[PDB]
C-alpha cells in the first residue's frame, strides 16, 4: 500500500502499468509452488507470524505452576531491487510500447526463484523447511526417462502406505520435464502414459526443483502463507535512474512431511 510509496516515483501511470504487466506475466507463468500448495491469502503488511497452535515446555519452572510457550513461524519480508532508466519510462508517454524493462523481468524471476526454492528445498535463514528436504521417504532413483511410469506408481504406493491418500501430482524440474516430454518408447510418447497415471491437469514444470516430485493434492499438507503479496515499490531516484523493488512477505509450512516422495532426476 503506502509502504510502496509509488506516488513519489517520477513514473507516469502508463509506465507503472507497463512495469506491473511485465512483472505479472512472469509471476503468473513461473510461480510453481503456488500452483501446488494451499494458499493462506494475503493478510497485509501487519501480519507477522503464522500461529502453529503448538506449545513448547519451558525449562526451569517451579512445581506449583505449569508454563508453556506458544510456537509461531514468523514471516520473511523479501525485497529484490532493480533499476530503470527514467528516459525509457518517459518513452511510454510519447507512445512507445516496448520500453526497456529487462531489469523488471530479472527482479521478478529472482523473486520467483526465492519463493519456489524456499517451497521446494527450504530456506534455513528464514526458518523454512521445504517439501523435498522434509520428506522422510527414501528418494527414488529414476535411471532413465522410460522408468518414469513405474517410479510414479512406486511413489504413489509409498504415499498410500504412509496413510497419505488423495490424487497425486507429478512435479518435474526442468531437465526431467524436457526429457519426459521429448521421450518416446518405440515411438509412443512416454509423457502420454505418465499423464494417464496422474492428475489430469498439465504437469507442473518447476524451475527451482531438482529432479522430480510426487505429492498428494488432497490438501492440508503444505501451506504457503502470504502477508504482503508480490508488489512493486519505489525506493529512490536520481536524474537518470529510478530504483524500484519487488516486495513480498511470506512463509511456508510443511504440515505433513510424508506427503511427498522425491524422484532422482531422469
Amino acid at each position: 500500500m503506502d509502504l510502496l510509496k509509488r506516488h513519489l516515483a517520477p513514473i507516469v501511470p502508463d509506465a507503472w502499468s507497463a512495469i506491473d504487466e511485465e512483472a505479472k506475466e512472469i509471476f503468473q507463468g513461473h510461480l510453481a509452488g503456488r500452483k501446488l500448495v494451499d494458499f493462506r491469502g494475503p493478510f497485509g503488511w501487519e501480519y507477522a507470524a503464522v500461529n502453529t497452535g503448538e506449545l513448547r515446555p519451558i525449562d526451569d519452572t517451579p512445581e506449583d505452576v505449569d508454563m508453556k510457550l506458544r510456537q509461531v513461524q514468523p514471516l520473511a519480508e523479501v525485497r529484490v531491487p532493480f533499476t530503470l532508466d527514467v528516459t525509457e519510462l518517459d518513452s511510454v508517454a510519447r507512445g512507445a510500447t516496448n520500453p526497456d524493462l529487462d531489469d523488471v523481468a530479472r527482479a521478478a524471476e529472482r523473486m520467483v526463484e526465492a519463493e519456489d526454492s524456499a517451497i521446494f528445498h527450504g530456506w534455513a535463514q528464514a526458518g523454512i523447511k521445504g517439501i523435498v528436504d522434509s520428506t522422510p521417504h527414501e528418494a527414488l532413483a529414476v535411471a532413465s526417462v522410460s522408468d518414469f511410469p513405474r517410479a510414479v506408481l512406486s511413489a504413489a504406493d509409498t504415499l498410500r502406505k504412509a496413510g497419505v491418500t488423495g490424487p497425486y501430482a507429478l512435479v518435474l524440474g526442468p531437465k526431467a520435464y524436457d526429457d519426459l516430454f521429448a521421450a518416446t518408447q518405440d515411438g509412443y510418447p512416454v509423457a502420454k502414459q505418465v499423464q494417464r497415471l496422474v492428475v489430469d491437469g498439465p504437469l507442473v514444470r518447476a524451475n527451482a526443483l531438482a529432479g522430480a516430485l510426487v505429492m498428494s493434492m488432497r490438501g492440508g499438507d503444505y501451506e504457503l502463507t502470504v502477508g504482503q503479496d508480490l508488489s512493486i515499490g519505489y525506493a529512490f531516484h536520481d536524474r537518470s535512474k529510478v530504483e524500484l523493488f519487488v516486495a513480498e512477505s511470506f512463509t511456508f509450512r510443511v504440515l505433513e512431511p510424508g506427503a511427498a516422495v522425491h524422484l532422482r532426476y531422469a
Binding site: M1, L4, L31, K35, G41, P42, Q228, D229, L230
Partner: peptide, 9 residues
C-alpha cells in the same frame, strides 16, 4: 497495492 497474484491453483 499488490500485483494481485494470490493463489495460483
Amino acid at each position: 497495492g499488490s500485483l494481485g497474484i494470490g493463489s495460483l491453483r
